[PDB]
């Protein structure tokens, strides 16, 4: 369940993969792990599927209610604090989830929330079982002066390097790009395949 999200100068790039497996047996080869919860905000879930989808519905409804009755979008730190309180009220009967929240209000932010409720802002983050391979790739090639195209190439390279050594990850790659000018944009499948072909990878 490899997830990744990096920041740039006025852009957030968040990418996942798609394989649902809870055995040594592959149930589904095409799942959803990257969601849109506001106009300029996304969220990647990784962990237990049911609890993840319930948290997704609860966050989408409450963000939409706040936006309608205040006529402004909710800030990203307020989103992370609200979700931290929601996870930490039930810390003894917990949720088995591990999720990321990224967005743009005046500057790009990425928050990383664990199953007890601790949210820590960092530049780049990665959750899942392929997270050490993703942190190994991003430790040696990430730079703050990169452009949007180089970032899209980097997250594809990182997930495609994590797919080779982790048995629980695989499939096509979702990529979404968040910008203040263009909003939440999810890149098409043929464009992702063109990226993979011009880099020199398989599947």
């Amino acid at each position: 369940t490899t997830t990744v999200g990096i920041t740039l100068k006025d852009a957030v790039i968040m990418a996942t993969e798609r394989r649902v497996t809870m055995e040594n047996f592959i149930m589904h080869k095409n799942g959803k792990k990257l969601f849109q919860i506001d106009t300029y905000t996304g969220m990647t879930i990784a962990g237990l599927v049911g609890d993840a989808q319930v948290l997704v519905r609860y966050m989408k409804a409450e963000l939409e209610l706040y936006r309608l009755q205040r006529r402004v979008n909710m800030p990203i730190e307020a989103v992370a604090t609200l979700l931290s309180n929601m996870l930490n009220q039930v810390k003894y009967m917990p949720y088995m989830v591990q999720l990321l929240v990224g967005g743009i209000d005046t500057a790009p932010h990425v928050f990383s929330i664990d199953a007890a409720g601790g949210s820590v802002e960092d530049i780049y983050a990665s959750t899942g079982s392929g997270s050490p391979f993703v942190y190994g790739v991003l430790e040696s090639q990430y730079s703050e002066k990169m452009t949007v195209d180089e970032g899209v190439d980097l997250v594809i390279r990182a997930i495609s390097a994590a797919k080779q050594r982790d048995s629980a990850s695989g499939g096509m790659i979702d990529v979404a790009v968040i910008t203040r000018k263009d909003g939440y944009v999810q890149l098409p499948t043929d464009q992702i395949e063109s990226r993979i072909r011009k880099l020199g990878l398989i599947l």
């Binding site: 519905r57 409804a61 939409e64 309608l68 009755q69």
Partner: protein, 225 residues
């Protein structure tokens, strides 16, 4: 009899009547379907100059796919619109989408029927009209201080109820482009509210099926005025 919701000597709920004459004292508003959607125009009579004109809004959104304009007591209006908002969010969490807007008007109407029914509480002295598209299509409703709902193609509410509904009864055409629809609506709002020899710039929103919500700005309404 005349002080709490019990029956008349002949079949009349006196408090629910007095609520209807409370909503006859309000501000006028109307709405009508057009070719592929529905509009809602409230009169907005910004009385003083110290009122922050565009911040007071009587066309309030329940969702991205149901809107509401109200008339009557304004406090009960605000409380009832907030109940409608959280009920729409309940249906979004439970079923996944707002499939019927008639469900949303019926739950709010049941909420008003309860305080029509029980003693120890007065009826909601407020009337609303709901408008939006669902899976069925464009719908336009009405609500009553008893909880009575009716579905219309064109309706009104407020102080200019009867004069606007007379003009709508004469001059409405069923399938109509958006521009001529908002023109007919403004002529309806004029013919009633031109008894104080002024109208003003009104507030008006619209949807066409497929798209989200669009409330006009201050500049666009004065072209049709």
């Amino acid at each position: 009899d005349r002080a709490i919701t019990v029956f008349s000597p002949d079949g009349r709920l006196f408090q629910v009547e007095y609520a209807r004459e409370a909503v006859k004292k309000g501000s006028t508003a109307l709405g009508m379907k057009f070719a592929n959607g529905v509009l809602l125009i409230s009169d907005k009579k910004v009385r003083s100059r110290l009122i922050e004109q565009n911040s007071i809004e009587a066309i309030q959104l329940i969702d991205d796919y149901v809107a509401a304009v109200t008339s009557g007591l304004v406090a009960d209006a605000r409380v009832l619109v907030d109940f409608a908002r959280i009920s729409a969010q309940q249906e979004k969490v439970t079923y996944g989408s707002l499939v019927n807007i008639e469900n949303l008007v019926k739950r709010v109407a049941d909420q008003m029927q309860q305080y029509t029914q029980y003693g120890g509480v007065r009826p909601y002295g407020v009337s609303l009209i709901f408008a939006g598209i669902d899976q069925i299509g464009p719908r336009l409703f009405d609500c009553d201080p008893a909880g009575t709902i009716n579905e219309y193609k064109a309706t009104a509410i407020g102080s200019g109820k009867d004069a606007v509904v007379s003009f709508l009864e004469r001059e409405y055409k069923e399938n109509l482009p958006e521009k001529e629809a908002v023109t007919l609506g403004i002529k309806a709002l004029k013919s009633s509210l031109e008894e104080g020899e002024e109208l003003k710039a009104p507030e008006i929103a619209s949807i066409t099926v497929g798209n989200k919500y669009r409330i006009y700005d201050q500049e666009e309404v004065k072209k049709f005025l």
